[PDB]
Structures are given as structure tokens and as C-alpha cells.
Amino acid sequence: GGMVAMVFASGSHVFGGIGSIFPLFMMVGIMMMMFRGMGGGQQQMSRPKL
Amino acid sequence: GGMVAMVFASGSHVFGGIGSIFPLFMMVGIMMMMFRGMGGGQQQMSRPKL
Amino acid sequence: GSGYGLGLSTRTQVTGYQFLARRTAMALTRWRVRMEIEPGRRQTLAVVASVSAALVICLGALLWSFISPSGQLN
Amino acid sequence: GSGYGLGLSTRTQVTGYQFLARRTAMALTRWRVRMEIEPGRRQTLAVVASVSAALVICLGALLWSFISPSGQLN
């Protein structure tokens, strides 16, 4: 967010349409790794069960 | 990408905002169709293990 | 007759026939059916790859035409 | 003898040494080795968190430096 915001203060406003697709698509890639990061499960232990 | 790029050189520049949401959502569908073929099993025969 | 004519057929019958065709085809050139590896397939696919690359470049050139035509002088 | 010098090593050996290092470090200050809870880890992690937070605020200052500089006079 900072990397993008710093460009707007310069006035180049290169984003929008053609440019925005990169940060837009790039954002999904980061979320997709954390999902793989949380892998596994189904052990089924929890405070309400105990 | 070629279909999209071809419209800009013609000067219609219809993309950006409202319009760009289609190829954006569309791009996810193609990726989703390919990844579905990957989940075929749970076994390993990688070179390192052989 | 039993197999004569032009009746219906199924998908499993299509691959089955092509398997016998490859096996009997290499039999004419290599005189053996061991078929450890099947190079006929590869030699065929290689042609398919060549033509596809040609079509891709051909289409790549058409895309360039719309991006930069001849009337743009001076 | 064996074990001496700069030989090769593996990743399982790196954790093994850290396990013995913590257990002995605990024995010097608490004189017991039960280690039901391992407080050295947490106290260390608290420092790392401290250092990380300082750097995060620092970059925030760098971010504002480009957004609203002091050079915009007159």
C-alpha cells in the first residue's frame, strides 16, 4: 500500500486501467501464500469441547 | 491480453473502472480451470527420494 | 456380416483401433513389437508442435498490424 | 579426535545444539531442569518484537517524508 501511495504524491498517476492490473493481481498472490501457510487441520480440539 | 491491448491502440480506451472488472473476474476463471486438474492424488516418486 | 458396414461406435473403440494401428505400423519399419518406447508418437507430435508455433507467430503478426498500421507517416 | 575441527553439518544438528544450549542455560539460573514451561524462548521473543516495532514506526516516518515534504515553501 505504501509503495503504491508514494507514486500518487509524485503526481504520475500511472495507475488506473493498464497500470492497476499489476498491483490488483499482485495482491491476490500474497493472500494465496498465507492460505497454503495455514495448511492441515481436522484434529478437532476446542475450548467448548473440553 | 492481446484482445485487451488491441482496443487501446484503437483509442476507444473503454477500460478502467467499471469496464476493467470483467477481464479481472474473467482472468480468475481461467486460472481456476487449470488448477482443478492438479489435485489428482497423494503419493510421491520425486527424483530426490528415488 | 458381423463387423461390416457403417454402424455406430463408441469412444473406447476409437483409441483401441489407433493402438493397433501404431503397433502394426512400427512392425513394418522395425520388424519387432517389443515397443519398449514408442517413438512414432513423438515423431508425430513434433510436427504438430512445428505447425502450432507457425500459427502462433502468424497470429502474433496480425496483432502487430492493429497496434501500428501503415498510414502513420511523418 | 572425533568431533573436533570444522567438519560438515546438517539442519537437524543445528536444532539439536540449540536444545542443549537452552537446557543448560536454564540450569545455571534455576538449578533445576524440569522445563515444564520454557521461559527463555518467550523472554527472547519479547525483545525481537520490541526491535521489530521500532523499525516499523521508523519506515512510517520515511513514508510521510515523500508524501508531505518540507521543501514545498513559498
Swiss-Prot record, chains A, B:
Signal peptide annotation: none
Task: Please describe what happens when the gene is knocked out.
Answer: Mutants are defective in the secretion of EsxN, PPE41 and PE_PGRS proteins.
Q: Any transmembrane segments, and where?
A: 15-35
Q: Where can this protein be found? A: Cell inner membrane
Q: What extra comment accompanies this record?
A: Part of the eccB5-eccC5 operon, which is essential for in vitro growth.
Q: How does it assemble?
A: Part of the ESX-5 / type VII secretion system (T7SS), which is composed of cytosolic and membrane components. The ESX-5 membrane complex is composed of EccB5, EccC5, EccD5 and EccE5.
Question: What's the stated role of this polypeptide?
Answer: Part of the ESX-5 specialized secretion system, which is responsible for the secretion of EsxN and a number of PE_PGRS and PPE proteins, including PPE41.
Protein name per Swiss-Prot or TrEMBL? ESX-5 secretion system protein EccC5
Species this chain originates from: Mycobacterium tuberculosis (strain ATCC 25618 / H37Rv)
Curated annotation (Swiss-Prot), chains C, D:
From the Swiss-Prot or TrEMBL record, state where the protein is found: Cell inner membrane
Q: How does it assemble?
A: Part of the ESX-5 / type VII secretion system (T7SS), which is composed of cytosolic and membrane components. The ESX-5 membrane complex is composed of EccB5, EccC5, EccD5 and EccE5.
- Similarity annotation: Belongs to the EccB family.
Q: Which organism is it from?
A: Mycobacterium tuberculosis (strain ATCC 25618 / H37Rv)
Instruction: Provide the membrane-side ranges marked Cytoplasmic in the record.
Output: 1-46
Q: What additional remark is attached to this entry?
A: Part of the eccB5-eccC5 operon, which is essential for in vitro growth.
* Membrane-spanning segments: 47-67
Q: Which domain of life is it from?
A: Bacteria
Q: What does this protein do?
A: An ATPase (shown for residues 80-506). Part of the ESX-5 specialized secretion system, which is responsible for the secretion of EsxN and a number of PE_PGRS and PPE proteins, including PPE41.
The signal sequence is none
Q: What is this protein called?
A: ESX-5 secretion system ATPase EccB5
